[PDB]
Amino acid sequence: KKNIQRLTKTFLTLSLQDMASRVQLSGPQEAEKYVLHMIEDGEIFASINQKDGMVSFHDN
Amino acid sequence: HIEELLRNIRTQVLIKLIKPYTRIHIPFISKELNIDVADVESLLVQCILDNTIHGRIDQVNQLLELDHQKRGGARYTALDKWTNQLNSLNQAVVSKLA
């Protein structure tokens, strides 16, 4: 979760496949579920677009 | 020395032209200055890097955005300073003895 949060200070829109290569989650689906769990708890401000499989960070 | 000229006059025209605008089109400046897009972009970059033109260039849309924003929020910065000082004074009082 700390690594994912640190990812939001540099990136505005990250592909899920690319995202599951710096935090070492080994799979886009696991990264998606982790991001969804983090959003549900209010730790992060992000949105998931399943058309391109991309996570977009709002930070507003 | 003719290369130094044909550049100072263009710079003066560019400064005089973009005064009342907030979002201008680069091809419009190219038409006004009788030069192509690449030279206009290079001139704008050189002018901005010299702290002469208060603006920025949007390369995606080929736009020049001026600086008719950033009102006088100096109050805020003053408050920030105050906050910092307060924090320091805190460390003086709590850790005096106990």
């Binding site: 540099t10 592909s15 | 805020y76």
Partner: protein, 404 residues
């Protein structure tokens, strides 16, 4: 430091110097240029045959022998006849000091120090010159002795002492027609000392005040590498508002820049936002630069700081930059540029955000009011926590609770 296979002329390079210093630099080349070993070592042997080398002569000689004999008769000549010469010089130092003539004693100590430098015993020559210090009673005498002490201490690799002596030599005789050779010598020595001291900005500041006409001193450094050092340090540690006043418009440095066209081209292309050519010529100059002493250690850091400065300067005027053109201009792939930008953003030099869907670097504007409010609220919460903590402490320190 090894396996660099560069190309560099050694005849004119070594011909620009004089004395044992040349040999030193040649040794450095032998340490860092595996392809030029035979010729460089042969030229070093030819140069050192003229000098009075004793230990390091055999050093380089057996090194070249192992890489691939010696005129042993002149080695006997060196030892026994040069020790006879040492007996003669000692004897006439006693003769001169018997009359206690200050100039005579200074000249004797100077000759002894020069001979010790030629024989490689400059360590004892340093103590001899510190002894001769007490016999200096004139302003020019002191100036000359500090210049000589700085010279011999350069061979010792003690830059702090050299800098201290430079400062005292500038400050003692109320600094300042007269020949500017002394001023250029002290400024160049201070610049070299500061460059070896990991302080590039001060070295560039104090080295830019040299004159080509007064730069006549083939014993410390040639004007070519002086210009190279000045240009690199200015390009790496001077901002844009300071590079134009002192490196671009300064008429004193035009002669140095004209001597070396390539560094002038690098500086001018960097100043004109032409980064591809500048980086390419920097890359092709790295091979030559790796063979320079007083430089080989601090080259990677200098290049890294130049590249980071170029990256920041390119993005300074833009608000939304396409990374395809950025990667093309920097002679790199998009992935490497993305990684470098991420590192720069995490470090805290560029306030920007990367969009990988369209590969676009957007500028980030900070909302001053929001961060002000957030900082104030955080400070208030921290202060409340600290106040409650100390109040509990005061409650517990009054009842004598000490865990006996």
């Amino acid at each position: 430091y090894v396996v660099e296979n560069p190309s560099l002329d050694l005849e004119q390079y070594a011909a620009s110097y004089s004395g044992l210093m040349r040999i030193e630099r040649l040794q450095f080349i032998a340490d860092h240029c595996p392809t030029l070993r035979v010729e460089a070592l042969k030229m070093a042997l030819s140069f050192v045959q003229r000098t009075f080398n004793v230990d390091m002569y055999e050093e380089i000689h057996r090194k070249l022998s192992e890489a691939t004999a010696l005129d042993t008769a002149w080695v006997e000549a060196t030892r026994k006849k040069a020790l006879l010469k040492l007996e003669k010089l000692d004897t006439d130092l006693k003769n001169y000091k018997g009359n206690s003539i200050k100039e005579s004693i200074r000249r004797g100590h100077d000759d002894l120090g020069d001979h010790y430098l030629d024989c490689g015993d400059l360590s004892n020559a340093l103590k001899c010159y510190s002894r001769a210090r007490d016999y200096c009673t004139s302003a020019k005498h002191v100036i000359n002795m500090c210049l000589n002490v700085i010279k011999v201490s350069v061979y010792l690799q003690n830059w702090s002492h050299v800098l201290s002596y430079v400062s005292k030599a500038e400050s003692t005789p109320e600094i300042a027609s007269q020949t500017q050779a002394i001023l250029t010598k002290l400024k160049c020595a201070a610049g070299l000392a500061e460059l070896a001291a990991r302080k590039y900005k001060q070295a560039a500041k104090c080295l830019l005040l040299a004159s080509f006409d007064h730069c006549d001193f083939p014993e410390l450094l040639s004007p070519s590498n002086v210009a190279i050092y000045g240009g690199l340090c200015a390009l790496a540690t001077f901002d844009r508002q300071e590079l134009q006043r002192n490196v671009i418009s300064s008429s004193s440095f035009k002669l140095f820049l004209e001597l070396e066209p390539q560094v002038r081209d690098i500086i001018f292309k960097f100043y004109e936002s032409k980064y591809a050519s500048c980086l390419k010529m920097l890359d092709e100059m790295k091979d030559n630069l790796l063979l320079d002493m007083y430089l080989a250690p601090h080259v990677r850091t200098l290049y890294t700081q130049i590249r980071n400065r170029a990256l920041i300067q390119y993005f300074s005027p833009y608000v939304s930059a396409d990374m395809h053109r950025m990667a093309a201009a920097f002679n790199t792939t998009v992935a490497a540029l993305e990684d470098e930008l991420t590192q720069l953003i995490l470090e805290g030099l560029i306030s920007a955000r990367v969009d990988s869907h369209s590969k676009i670097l957007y500028a980030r504007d900070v909302d001053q009011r929001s961060t002000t409010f957030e900082k104030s609220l955080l400070m208030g919460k921290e202060f409340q926590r600290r106040a409650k903590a100390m109040m509990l402490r005061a409650a517990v320190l009054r009842n004598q609770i000490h865990v006996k």
